[model samples]
Target: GSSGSSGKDFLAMFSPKCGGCNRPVLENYLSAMDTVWHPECFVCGDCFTSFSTGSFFELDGRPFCELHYHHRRGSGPSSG
Candidate 1:
């Protein structure tokens, strides 16, 4: 298994920055590379950083980066 950064809780990286948002990724149990998060969960999931949590979005039952989300939800410039 490939490890990312310095986290001990099986925290994997999905390209660090979401395709949709330019925010840094936070390690979570469900949305990690090792585990799969629910559809709704993925949309509303985020990395709980020092003070604020990084957020994402959901579309077609897939997790979209902030930018991808905007485009998927018919807003930004993400490929559908």
Candidate 2:
């Protein structure tokens, strides 16, 4: 019979919640933007694309891709 299984049970008690999906990150978590996230959930808030270079821009506490980041700042290509 299993008697000393308290360590395993204690480890299962807490799991960090993903900041993007708001769900518990069970495995392969990414820590960024001052919060935890699943690798797939850490995507651009504007275009929803995963960062290939592991580089992103943050605005108002949200992560954005390079192109969208510039657009949000009104510095990208503007058709006017």
Candidate 3:
């Protein structure tokens, strides 16, 4: 298989399961880090979910997933 255009596309997005839930539910995107995290890292304790999208940055220990990540500024998508 080859890389897809969708942001959800990955070489192995489901292989790593978080100890928190023990299931393949988290959505990770490195571009969301914005000078805080690396490609294989997470800003929040909840895996390496994107800081640009997840509630993890503001909701204490809970991290954000692409499906659940929220933008802090005006409504719309973001690159940071």
Candidate 4:
């Protein structure tokens, strides 16, 4: 009769990637909307406004500026 026991093993690994370019993030990346993106790539999906200087909204996992976000939601103030 023989009895043997083995220790448990676990493995976990992850590398941040650009949501816009789908490339591995090396440095200076932006984390937003539950995803990682390059600074240059993390702009409003509608007008391409950089969010570095302002806050942003997220829809369908895409970043959007306040104006565009409201526009998409059909509730933004009208000004022309």
Q: Could you say which candidate leads in TM-score?
A: 4
Question: Arrange candidates by lDDT, highest first: which order?
Answer: 4, 2, 1, 3
lDDT of 1 at 64: 46
- For model 3, what is the C-alpha lDDT against the true structure? 0.42
For every model shown, the clashing-pair count is 7, 0, 5, 0
Which ten contiguous residues of candidate 4 have the minimum total lDDT? 71-80
Candidate 1, residues 1-80: lDDT per residue as tens digits? 89678747653555554333434445641453433443224453233112124654455555546654565467543445
For each candidate in turn, the TM-score is 0.29, 0.65, 0.19, 0.69
Count of backbone collisions within predicted model 3: 5
Off by over 4 Å in 3: 1-35, 43-57, 66-80
How accurate locally, in lDDT, is each candidate? 0.45, 0.77, 0.42, 0.79
Per-residue alpha-carbon lDDT of candidate 3 for residues 1-80, written as tens digits (9 for 90 to 100): 78757566556653444434334434552322222223344444535554544244433234455344454223654444
lDDT of 4 by residue, 1-80 (tens): 99999988654437878998877787898788677899888888779989878788877667889888887677744433
Q: Distance (Å) between predicted and true CA of 13, model 1?
A: 26
Shift of residue 29 alpha carbon in model 4, Å: 0.7
Q: Give the per-residue lDDT of model 2 (tens digit) for 1-80.
A: 66664434344546678986778876788887767887887889879999768698877778789888888779645342
Q: Candidate 1 overall Cα lDDT vs. reference?
A: 0.45
Candidate that scores best on lDDT: 4
